[PDB]
Amino acid sequence: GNTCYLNSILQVLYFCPGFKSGVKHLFNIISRKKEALKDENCKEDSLASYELICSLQSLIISVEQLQASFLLNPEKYTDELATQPRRLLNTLRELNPMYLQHDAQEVLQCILGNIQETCQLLKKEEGSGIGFELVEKLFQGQLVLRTRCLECESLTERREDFQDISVPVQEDEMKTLRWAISQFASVERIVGEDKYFCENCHHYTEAERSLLFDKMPEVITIHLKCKINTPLLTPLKLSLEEWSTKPTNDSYGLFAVVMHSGITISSGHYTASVKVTDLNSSLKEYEGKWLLFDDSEVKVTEEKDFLNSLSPPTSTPYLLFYKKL
Amino acid sequence: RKVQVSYVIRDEVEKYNRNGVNALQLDPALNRLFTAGRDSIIRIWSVNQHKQDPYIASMEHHTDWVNDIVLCCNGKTLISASSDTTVKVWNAHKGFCMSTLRTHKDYVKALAYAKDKELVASAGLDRQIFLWDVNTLTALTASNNTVTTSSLSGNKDSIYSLAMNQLGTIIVSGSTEKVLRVWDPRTCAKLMKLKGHTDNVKALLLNRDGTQCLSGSSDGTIRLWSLGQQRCIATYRVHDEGVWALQVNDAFTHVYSGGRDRKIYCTDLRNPDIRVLICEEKAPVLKMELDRSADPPPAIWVATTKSTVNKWTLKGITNPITPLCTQPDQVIKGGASIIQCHILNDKRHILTKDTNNNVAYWDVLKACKVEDLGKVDFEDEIKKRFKMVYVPNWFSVDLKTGMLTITLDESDCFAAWVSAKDAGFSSPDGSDPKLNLGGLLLQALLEYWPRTHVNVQKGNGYFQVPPHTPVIFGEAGGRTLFRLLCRDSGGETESMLLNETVPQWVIDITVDKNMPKFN
């Protein structure tokens, strides 16, 4: 198969907290409506978005079945592991005006947006006839765009939403994640030819365009701009209190990395890796280890081996994921 | 590059400040106070209790905000920094502008002074500090026209404060760089980069011999630094919001501070627990000036964002959080800033609203007020004067000073072509041509310029703007090129400076008398 850019983020989403039970209790409603109309006329555009939830549920059931057998290469047993991503990708391509390899971040945002779309479509038939806040309260947060008139030192505040956090690598050499976060969220100064007109001062003054974090989701997705074969420091623990509106001690931890192999992004291969914690059911053997996904082959590797696979310049990481601790 | 023609709609003499005051200067020997109002007018008042209307004089040669002023030579000369990218030198005794250094690239924010050396320094948003001798500037005319800079460089961001010691041996600059940069004013060499604050610094101070430094930043932290040790020795936290003004006694013992939080404190540097809430003003404090009639200072003058300036006495001879003053001892009342404006559908008249909600009706063409309307509803009065005739936009209104400043840009100055009968100009023969409002106004502003007088007429032939109307030629962005009153166009020096300064798109209409044409 040649659907690595989708399969990587699918494997990442599989281990996201609340995503599993969320899509389960969301597909429950679709099955209820199917059988209720079987006992008892919607738009086809919404119907296409409805169907991918059932497709995702079948996929996740199959992945759970494959996990119970501890089969790490089902290519010789079940072709379904490759046929299901195509079943999802056809519906995805149908749901979009956009476009054998493409962006792994674009497909992530697209899947999340389609799930939010069907969440709204099911909301519009719940109170008119928690559950539908899946994507909104897992990956999407509350960004704040306060700018400060350096003369009167007054703050003007605006609110926005965000799922991904696009971030550069180098400047225009080993940069910590703090520097790369600052490059995206820190201050751009308004001063010179085009100043900022302050209504309070009624005058041209200097300003500071800064970004801030107000209310954070359960999982932070981090996009990494590049191709550049120079990686950066990837810290395990993470806290956003330095760039937060209301400084709170909600820290996060790295649990999923999507890496890119090949210089040309036109036909580069995406590889996935996910850490496993809170395995309450039984498997403490895998607790702390890292699963690596390359094509249909999943492997178990220690934390230090994966951390050395990151650091030196073969496959550079493309997406990072941090869950709340 | 692009030149705009502005003019101020005002009375000939504005006794009171139509905007807030950014700096204060006191003359001890003559009992005179200099207020640098944001309305581009430096006002001299008398500080005597015997005065009931303490107005003395006005100095109105500035264009934009006036941020800092400095007295020199026993009160003979004054130097003012302004947001019009100019530093003006005036006679303090007779209140008239002597020179205008157009050296700064951006706003001029602060001035540092040394009275033992009679030495001044100007700093602003252009990341450059310029040193000047007072006696060199006082001996300047249109003939004696020679004075360049001795600039200090290094600031990686814009400057907001400046200070020098009394002896004039050490200078310090505070920037939005969050770092105090120290230079030697004699040798012009970088001394140290004090790295203590975490926000912009807006007030600095130094002792007599230049051994210790005081700093007031927008983080609420006052800081005392030892110069020889290159370190901050003390950090006081007496304000809730930013610290914007600083004063110190003669012995360099108590610091007088204020800022965004209107509370003003006299805190002992040797023990921060010994601080007294002097008073909480009505508006955030911009600057302060101590009375030095005794080693225990008797009173302090406070200039805030409001137009009025207060004088609070310092007489403790209570205990908890009581403000030392429930009301100021002296009050210099300022005017009211025109806060809102609206242009009618005919693009001929203007409806303005000041701080007291008093609405006024103006004729931007004639450049004069029509009537005062009182505390009427602004939107209801806007909809109450509804004329259906459409006229294009041919100008812009500006309130950077608090008063009406009408600006005309080359692109759309000559866009208005109105009917003479609809314009109110009744010809005896019942004629009605088409008149360009921009051209008529340009000819009215340059009515007293003989170069426009072509054989001979004088004016546009329909109306006359007031002769006191200040006409300005300024570059778009902040640069101010020339300023003069209308009737002052008859002066030979003003005439030559106009011949050099007036742009071509004004010359071809006011002098060449040609048609404006389109685009």
Ligand SMILES: COc1ncnc(C2CC2)c1-c1ncc2[nH]cc(Cc3ccc(-c4nc(C(F)(F)F)cn4C)cc3)c2n1
């Ligand atoms: C999460 O995998 C996916 N999720 C969502 N979609 C997919 C497919 C792209 C549509 C996959 C996907 N991709 C490539 C794969 N190759 C083999 C499999 C089956 C398998 C996977 C994991 C395990 C396992 N789990 C633990 C632990 F620690 F969680 F208990 C330990 N081990 C060894 C056991 C078998 C497979 N599955």
Ligand SMILES: [Zn+2]
């Ligand atoms: Zn402001």
